[PDB]
Amino acid sequence: IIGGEFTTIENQPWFAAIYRRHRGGSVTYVCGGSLISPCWVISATHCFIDYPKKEDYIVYLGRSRLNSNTQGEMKFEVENLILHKDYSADTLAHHNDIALLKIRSKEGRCAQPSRTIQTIALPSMYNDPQFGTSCEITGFGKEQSTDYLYPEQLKMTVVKLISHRECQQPHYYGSEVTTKMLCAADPQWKTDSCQGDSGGPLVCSLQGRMTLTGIVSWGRGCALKDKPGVYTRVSHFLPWIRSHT
Amino acid sequence: ACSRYEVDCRGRXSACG
Ligand SMILES: *Cc1cc(C*)cc(C*)c1
Ligand SMILES: [Cl-]
Numbered sequence: 001i002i003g004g005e006f007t008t009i010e011n012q013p014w015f016a017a018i019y020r021r022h023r024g025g026s027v028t029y030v031c032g033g034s035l036i037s038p039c040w041v042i043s044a045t046h047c048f049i050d051y052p053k054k055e056d057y058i059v060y061l062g063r064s065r066l067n068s069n070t071q072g073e074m075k076f077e078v079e080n081l082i083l084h085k086d087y088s089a090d091t092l093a094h095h096n097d098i099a100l101l102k103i104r105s106k107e108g109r110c111a112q113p114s115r116t117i118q119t120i121a122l123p124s125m126y127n128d129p130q131f132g133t134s135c136e137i138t139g140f141g142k143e144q145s146t147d148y149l150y151p152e153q154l155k156m157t158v159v160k161l162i163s164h165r166e167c168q169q170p171h172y173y174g175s176e177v178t179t180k181m182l183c184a185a186d187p188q189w190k191t192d193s194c195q196g197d198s199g200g201p202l203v204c205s206l207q208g209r210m211t212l213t214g215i216v217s218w219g220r221g222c223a224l225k226d227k228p229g230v231y232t233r234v235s236h237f238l239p240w241i242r243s244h245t
Numbered sequence: 246a247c248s249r250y251e252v253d254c255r256g257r258x259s260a261c262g
Contacts, residue, residue, distance in 0.1 A: 195258035
């Protein structure tokens with residue numbers, strides 16, 4: 001996350017931190033995700049498309065730090081890893097950038113609600129907040145585009161929803177943005193998602209409900225003028241989510 | 246170069262492609 005502030009998992013308790021294990025037991029971060037039910041985390045297919053074997057992945061909930069453990073965290077295996085069979089990416093945009101992970105502890109259990117872990121509601125079909133609405137994104141992604149390191153502490157920031165019309169300008173992304181995507185950015189262009197933030201949540205209040213409006217997917221650079229964040233538009237993937245869940 | 250240890254290797258900001 002460019003800009004924004006350090007937070008803790010208690011302020012984003014639906015945030016899931018997804019890791020890959022290596023032949024030598026080295027564990028590296030992959031991407032973020034969101035807890036949408038006790039056994040299900042939603043994320044982005046592009047995060048997994050190169051190493052699609054569920055066995056390599058670990059998922060943490062209740063976790064506030066990237067390479068250290070935090071009190072109140074819970075560790076899960078991936079029982080099912082479901083990618084979107086129409087995933088594609090031209091050179092910039094990612095289409096159908098959405099994935100599900102069924103999580104299961106070693107005792108065979110799913111998440112339980114606590115101080116650090118809660119589910120995030122999905123929107124009802126085709127229901128997005130109005131443009132101008134202030135939303136939250138969270139992740140362990142880069143703090144600057146040029147960094148080689150990732151912050152150790154969870155961050156969040158606020159961004160505003162942008163109309164397709166406005167996002168579909170030449171000097172933004174044009175028709176590179178489809179109707180199954182959604183743009184958000186800082187009016188002053190100082191805060192944004194970046195590498196490592198993908199799969200993570202874009203959360204808005206909608207009908208007095210904290211709601212998973214988007215999933216961090218793509219964008220040109222990070223916090224670049226006229227280059228908003230581009231998010232999988234969850235309210236247009238309900239059938240896919242019901243049919244796999 | 247960019248490896249299998251790389252975080253979110255197809256994320257915005259990544260050198261892939
Ligand atoms: C080096 C590398 C790694 C991944 C996961 C993807 C691309 C394009 C390049
Ligand atoms: Cl599919």
